[PDB]
Design a protein around this ligand. Structure first.
Ligand SMILES: [Zn+2]
Ligand SMILES: [Zn+2]
Ligand SMILES: [Zn+2]
Ligand SMILES: [Zn+2]
Lengths: 72, 527, 585, 186, 187
RNA sequence: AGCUGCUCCCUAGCAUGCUACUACCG
RNA sequence: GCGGUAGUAGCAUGCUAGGGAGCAG
């Protein structure tokens, strides 16, 4: 299950980076730090809280229209 | 100032779905993802250039170096070297960068092109009477890794490597085209080369025991004296082609270009204190000279520092006495005793070297009495000479020779049955193969149909796992085979759907069968 | 790499010498090259002889040697003639159908857009080819617009007046606001940020938008943009439903919307519905009705210009709750009573060129006449509206075609929706003309309106027509009728109440002379829509098809809501016009 | 390849040779059918050679141009496949903590900062209406990210702090609704 | 290869061969006209075969000399670019202070690591955190390299201007913090 | 954006070499 | 009937060049 968390963290960081998030240094530093801790984690529960913390960054802005992208 | 980040690698989902289809990545399995594409924040380059703070001005025991250098010299008397003209240099990949500030106008092809075969020789003869400081750029690598530390590589300017190639190339290409020596640069592991290497280092020692190591941050913990000595040992062969002033000015140019050159890290010049720059012409051989120097120094320390009243074999005691005599009570080289000691070493300390990744087969009933270097002696030498503490979680020691080195060049060794006899093959870490399969740079994969050859190569490198007793290992190769099969017979159908004839003849069936791959590990060379 | 226009089979050949370089189906591409002057083709890599120092661009002579394309004198011994079998080598050659008749596309691509026959070919053809023709004409006119000289100002005379010079070797554009300039301020580095201006004879008169101080060295250009390849059709497929789809009917009704609701169920009864909208019948009020007829409907106010959406915005500040309106203007002064750049809003007010890609409960398209097939399909690209309303009329002013030279393009052939309006008829009709009296509604009804428009209040007997001859004199971009300029003052002196009437003119420079003589305000016939005045006057000036053809005059005559003045120098419509004729002084 | 014109000549020569060998007539007369048949396979195998080469070279060039087209369009659409694949994986993940915040952000509750993980530190959540308030906040407890938070400071859109008890269905159309609510981890 | 002096010879030989084959006079005629076609082929052989290698040799020579000419042209452009870069970057340095410190040397040769230290007209600082900022760039003036500088145009990592009053202790965690403080030499 | 070493795949060329067919001469 | 030579096609080996990709330090 953790391997899925690592893969989704990778793709999440890629989409965040192409959303032009590195224009603000502190935000990019926090994101890369969280991503590195997710990739190096050995157990699933802390991976998931760092995962939700990382996803909240994507949810914060308005660039990713969510209702359309959630088409089920 | 400019801040450079490191991006994360992309995801190849289709291969991951195929892997989970075949019952992979299940919890509690041995194979698991560990090699990822890490990311780095804004100030990643300078936070890695700052590691040169581990370089301290060091003094060397001169009356012992003046003997270790003789023995290391004798280790390199099998090859040839000399200056070569402009019309004989051999250069691969002429479209690489030309350093700073030359990368503002074109790649190395332009500067290797505009100079006629007389301008290059005019320059190479100019540098033998002058000193040319240069500016080195510093760049980060973008590759899979198992540790989150970045990697920084130095792009030296063209005016340095252009002349260093002419100066050193004859010896460099004579080292890489020799088989059976101590240095094993250029010997391939395919077609039964690894087995030949391993049977080379087992040569005639009596009660062997393997021993290996690697150096923590080898390029930055390098003292300046050992770099100088390595360059001197490399340039020694020019006894006839050059004068004595010419050799000194070439050495001064080397020290001005790869030892204290003004590194241009970021957007501003700094001063590199010391240590090798890893992106110059002769790094991979200077490191070999370093490694042999440390081995000889460890042997010298281990033999001198023994209570010479308990030693029972008379010959080694006389060796001790003469060793001290020619070390400290003498001033000039004694080639008779240098030959004597080199014979003693190569009879009781066999070696295999690449650029700082070594393997040593030593007689053990001597090392247990301190007549040759043990693995603590390298700790002591690295401590008082390299200013690094050698952790015993990086040096291994093996005693059952039927299994080869625990690790060499990042490949484990296994003894299988190949035909009628038994061979040694290098098998990689399976997680490395899977991580190369899944994480890629956006078109180089994530659509397998476009490449296919990368999967062919990866299945070539992942073959020796097919003989592994651990069942979860061979399924990696079998999965790779089935993925190549799926890719091929999906590309054919997709092209047929977009066209109206299918590929008339391919003979591609060899790619998804083991017979094409088992031929790369048998002792009969089809290049 | 896409599917070709005619065949929709995937291909990779692109017509090189062609204007917009369309995706060409392989054998279909061979037909296009052999039947046109377009002899250049580009695949993923271009089909040009790669041997150094070559010139040949025609595909036919090009042969395939190895991994490249070669003309006859450049090949290696091994070749493969690409121009073979009547089928140029290209991607998806077998998944190819070709076209039996391509000469329609051949004439569309070889079209300079000169005659009305060009627009006839564009409109009469099908979806993909009509879209291609629209894009090509837009790009081609945009190309000619910058081909004219530069508008440099070398002397500053006074306020609203300048002395301007022009580039040598290139002509001068007309002297009206029909083509608004755009100058930028030139500095030692580059030219930036002056603004959009209109130049007319004064010595020239510049009509800038905002306040500015123009000095010497500042020159104005006809700025061009990059026309992008359109995707959606001009009209979505028609489908008549069985119930009111997607909307909840209203509970109570308004008497001002009593005549609106009667036609409103059939608006929501089907996908798209067409309108017969005469001038001054409450079409904007008709559009407002859907908001009151459906409070929960998210309707979008769209038109060719912000000044036309302004009419919808004009009736929005009164009836529409301001808490749910949004006006979108790209980063020109206009109405901004709403909040700007708010996609997620109920009432959206924007021009067809700037509204982002959304979805709409029901669209209102104001002034469909001037919106050609280009912007007809632009809106469908942005929105897949659940309902569609076309507010406008084919019997209303179209966009002025700067490339149409000979022949007058038919009113029906403006675009797709106006074409069906003359064949199957309009779905709606508003039978009350809320401004024009019996003297105007009755006359305009018998002209192109099929006698379908009826009088509102009375025959005011304040609309007058005159018989006259005149002698015309013309200039670079105008024509002034001197006897009518003598007549107009002569008519107005003997009744001082007539001086409150505005002067309308086909060539606005003619009224510029009249404005000097009399001082009454100015009107442009081509843009007189949206604005109406109780007292307004007109001079026919010319009887040519440019000014006084049947439909381009209908807007000017309908400007007045009590009485209008117009001296007919012609006789084509003077006989038909049911106005009062008086003695010529 | 049999549709080539020279195949008819080859067939005629082969038939003549077969008839001659079935007859066994002469010694030199059939030698005419070795100086005309062995010749007959000289303009056939040479003419059947390059066309077989030509078809394969055409196939290999067309497939390489196809791969070039595919690689050209795949890098021109990356910033929608990234997101679609992302959310497909996220839905496959089936985690309650992610699901709660995704539903909330879809209906409007988008936090205006990183969600903190320590038991300290502040979270700031927009709540643009009242129905969305009904599910999440209950008195002094904030439910978000499947955690328990303590509401401390709500504020309207014009930066005027509002008391917690004031808000209600009747008085809901009386505040600048995009509230931001400061709360801390349990 | 049709304008060679072999096309006419082959044409006339084959014309004679076909004329006498239609005539069918003698077997010796057939032998003679077979020998004619068996000697006129060698004419055609080396008259239309070697000339098909001279063309390839000429073409490859032409391409090679084209490539050499392009190489020379690229050399010309890079020479011009390098000379103009040198001549445009030398004009920024020759201040009178540089000449002053070059005249005071015993030999005219001075170390490189003191020229910017004693003639630069602008100083760049990089500060990782507020604690280092307090000790070095405190206030609107600071002293480094035994000179006097005045702080001007403080900027953060995002390269946006930050005024001096913002950098307090409590406000520090709200700034991108490789602060690059610029200053100029005061007299 | 570095210096190497090894390996796989595609193409092009020269030369070498082999085989097969045709022609000339001895 | 043999040999030699000159052409044509096919096949193999190897050397060089160009392009793509992977691994190790
Ligand atoms: Zn030398
Ligand atoms: Zn065309
Ligand atoms: Zn087609
Ligand atoms: Zn050509």
């Amino acid at each position: 299950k953790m391997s899925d968390v690592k893969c989704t963290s990778v793709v999440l960081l890629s989409v965040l980076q192409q959303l032009r998030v590195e224009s603000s240094s502190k935000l990019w530093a926090q994101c890369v730090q969280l991503h590195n801790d997710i990739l190096l984690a050995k157990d699933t529960t802390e991976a998931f809280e760092k995962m939700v913390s990382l996803l909240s960054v994507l949810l914060s802005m308005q660039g990713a229209v969510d209702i359309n992208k959630l088409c089920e | 100032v400019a801040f450079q980040t490191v991006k994360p690698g992309n995801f190849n989902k289709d291969f991951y779905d195929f892997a989970v289809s075949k019952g992979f990545f299940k919890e509690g399995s041995s194979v698991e993802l560990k090699h990822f594409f890490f990311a780095q924040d804004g100030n990643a380059a300078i936070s890695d250039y700052d590691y040169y703070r581990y370089n301290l001005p060091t003094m060397c025991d001169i009356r012992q170096l003046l003997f270790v250098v003789e023995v290391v010299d004798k280790y390199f008397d099998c090859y040839d070297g000399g200056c070569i003209n402009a019309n004989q240099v051999i250069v691969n990949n002429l479209d690489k960068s030309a350093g700073f500030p030359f990368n503002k106008w074109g790649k190395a092809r332009l500067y290797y092109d505009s100079m006629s075969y007389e301008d290059q020789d005019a320059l190479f003869a100019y540098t033998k009477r002058n000193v040319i400081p240069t500016i080195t750029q510093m760049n980060l690598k973008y590759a899979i890794s198992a540790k989150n530390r970045a990697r920084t590589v130095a792009g030296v300017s063209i005016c340095s490597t252009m002349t260093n190639r002419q100066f050193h190339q004859k010896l460099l290409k004579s080292i890489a085209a020799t088989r059976g020596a101590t240095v094993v640069i250029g010997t391939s592991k395919f077609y039964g080369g690894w087995h030949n290497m391993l049977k080379t280092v087992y040569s005639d020692v009596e009660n062997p025991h393997l021993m290996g190591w690697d150096y923590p941050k080898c390029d930055r913990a390098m003292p300046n004296m050992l770099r100088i000595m390595a360059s001197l040992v490399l340039a020694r062969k020019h006894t006839t082609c050059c004068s004595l002033s010419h050799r000194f000015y070439r050495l001064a140019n080397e020290c001005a270009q790869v030892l204290s050159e003004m590194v241009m890290c970021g957007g501003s010049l700094y001063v590199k204190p010391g240590g090798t720059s890893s992106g110059d012409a002769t790094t991979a051989y200077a490191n070999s000279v370093f490694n042999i120097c440390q081995a000889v120094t460890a042997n010298v320390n281990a033999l001198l520092s023994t209570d010479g009243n308990k030693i029972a074999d008379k010959y080694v005691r006389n060796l001790q006495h003469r060793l001290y005599e020619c070390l400290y009570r003498n001033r000039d080289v004694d080639t008779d005793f240098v030959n004597e000691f080199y014979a003693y070493l190569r009879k009781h300390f066999s070696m295999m070297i690449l650029s700082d990744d070594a393997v040593v087969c030593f007689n053990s009933t001597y090392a247990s009495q301190g007549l040759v270097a043990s693995i603590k002696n390298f700790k002591s030498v690295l401590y008082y000479q390299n200013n690094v503490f050698m952790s015993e979680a990086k040096c291994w020691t093996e005693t059952d020779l039927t299994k080869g080195p625990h690790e060499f060049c990042s490949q484990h060794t296994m003894l299988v049955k190949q035909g009628d006899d038994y061979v040694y093959l290098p098998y990689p870490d399976p997680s490395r193969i899977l991580g190369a399969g899944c994480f890629v740079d956006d078109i180089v994969k994530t659509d397998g149909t476009l490449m296919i050859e990368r999967f062919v190569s990866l299945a070539i490198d992942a073959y020796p796992l097919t003989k592994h007793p651990n069942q979860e290992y061979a399924d990696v190769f079998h999965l790779y085979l089935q993925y190549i099969r799926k890719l091929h017979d999906e590309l054919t159908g997709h092209m047929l759907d977009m066209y109206s004839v299918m590929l008339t003849n391919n003979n591609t069936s060899r790619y998804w069968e083991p017979e094409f791959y088992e031929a790369m590990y048998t002792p009969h060379t089809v290049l | 790499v896409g599917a070709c226009v005619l065949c929709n089979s995937q291909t990779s050949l692109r017509c090189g010498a062609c204007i917009r370089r369309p995706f060409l189906c392989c054998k279909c591409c061979y037909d296009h090259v052999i039947s046109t002057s377009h002899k250049l083709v580009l695949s993923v890599n271009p089909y040009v002889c790669n041997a150094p120092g070559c010139d040949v661009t025609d595909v036919t002579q090009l042969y395939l040697g190895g991994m490249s394309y070669y003309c006859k004198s450049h090949k290696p011994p091994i070749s493969f003639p690409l121009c073979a079998n009547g089928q140029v080598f290209g991607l998806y050659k077998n998944t190819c159908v070709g076209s039996d008749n391509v000469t329609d596309f051949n004439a569309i691509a070889t079209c300079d857009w000169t005659n009305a026959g060009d627009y006839i070919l564009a409109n009469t053809c099908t979806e993909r080819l009509k879209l291609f023709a629209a894009e090509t004409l837009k790009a081609t006119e945009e190309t000619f617009k910058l081909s004219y000289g530069i508008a440099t100002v070398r002397e500053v005379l006074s306020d609203r007046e300048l002395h301007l010079s022009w580039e040598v070797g290139k002509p001068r554009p007309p002297l009206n606001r029909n083509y608004v300039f755009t100058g930028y301020r030139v500095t030692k580095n580059s030219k930036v940020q002056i603004g959009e201006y209109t130049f007319e004879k004064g010595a020239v008169v510049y009509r800038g938008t905002t306040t500015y101080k123009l000095n010497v060295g500042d020159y104005f250009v006809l700025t061009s943009h990059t026309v992008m390849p359109l995707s959606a059709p001009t009209l979505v497929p028609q489908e008549h439903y069985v119930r009111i789809t997607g909307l909840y009917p209203t509970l109570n009704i308004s008497d001002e919307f009593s005549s609106n609701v009667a036609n409103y169920q059939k608006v929501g009864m089907q996908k798209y519905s067409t309108l017969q909208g005469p001038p001054g019948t409450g079409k904007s009020h008709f559009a407002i009705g859907l908001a009151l007829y459906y409070p929960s409907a998210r309707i979008v106010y769209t038109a060719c210009s912000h000044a036309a959406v302004d009419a919808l915005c004009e009736k929005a500040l009164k009836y529409l709750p301001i808490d749910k309106c949004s006006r979108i203007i790209p980063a020109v002064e206009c109405f901004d009573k709403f909040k700007v750049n708010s996609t997620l809003e109920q009432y959206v007010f924007c021009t067809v060129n700037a509204l982002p890609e959304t979805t709409a409960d029901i669209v209102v398209f104001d002034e469909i006449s001037m919106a050609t097939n280009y912007d007809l399909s632009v809106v469908n690209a942005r929105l897949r509206a659940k309902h569609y309303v076309y507010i406008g009329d084919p019997a209303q002013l179209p966009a002025p075609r700067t490339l149409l030279t000979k022949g007058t393009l038919e009113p029906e052939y403006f675009n797709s929706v106006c074409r069906l309006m003359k064949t199957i008829g309009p779905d709606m009709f508003l039978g009350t003309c809320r401004r024009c009296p019996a003297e105007i509604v009755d006359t305009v009804s018998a002209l192109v309106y099929d006698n379908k428009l009826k009088a509102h209040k009375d025959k005011s007997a304040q609309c007058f027509k005159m018989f006259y001859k005149g002698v015309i004199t013309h200039d670079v971009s105008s024509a002034i009728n001197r006897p009518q300029i003598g007549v107009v003052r002569e008519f107005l002196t003997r009744n001082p109440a007539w001086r409150k009437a505005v002067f309308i003119s086909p060539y606005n420079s003619q009224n510029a002379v009249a404005s000097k003589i009399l001082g009454l305000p100015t009107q442009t016939v081509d843009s007189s829509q949206g604005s109406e005045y109780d007292y307004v006057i007109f001079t026919q000036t010319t009887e040519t098809a440019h000014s006084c053809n049947v439909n381009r005059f209908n807007v000017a005559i309908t400007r007045a809501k009590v009485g209008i003045l117009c001296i007919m120098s012609d006789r084509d419509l003077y006989d038909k016009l049911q106005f009062t004729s008086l003695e010529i002084p | 390849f049999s549709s080539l014109p020279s195949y008819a000549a080859f067939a005629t020569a082969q038939e003549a040779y077969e008839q001659a060998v079935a007859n066994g007539d002469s010694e030199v007369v059939l030698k005419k059918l070795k100086k005309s048949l062995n010749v007959a396979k000289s303009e056939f195998d040479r003419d059947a050679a390059m066309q077989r080469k030509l078809e394969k070279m055409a196939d290999q060039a067309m497939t390489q141009m196809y791969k070039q087209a595919r690689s050209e369009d795949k890098r021109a659409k990356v910033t929608s496949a990234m997101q679609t694949m992302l959310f497909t994986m996220l839905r496959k993940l089936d985690n309650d903590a992610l699901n709660n915040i995704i539903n909330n952000a879809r209906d409007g509750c988008v936090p205006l900062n990183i969600i903190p993980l320590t038991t300290a530190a502040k979270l700031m959540v927009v709540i643009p209406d009242y129905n969305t308030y009904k599910n999440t906040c209950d008195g002094t407890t904030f439910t978000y990210a499947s955690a328990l938070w303590e509401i401390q400071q709500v504020v309207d859109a014009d930066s005027k702090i509002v008391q917690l008890s004031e808000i209600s269905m009747d008085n809901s159309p009386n505040l600048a609704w995009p509230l931001i609510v400061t709360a801390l981890r349990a």
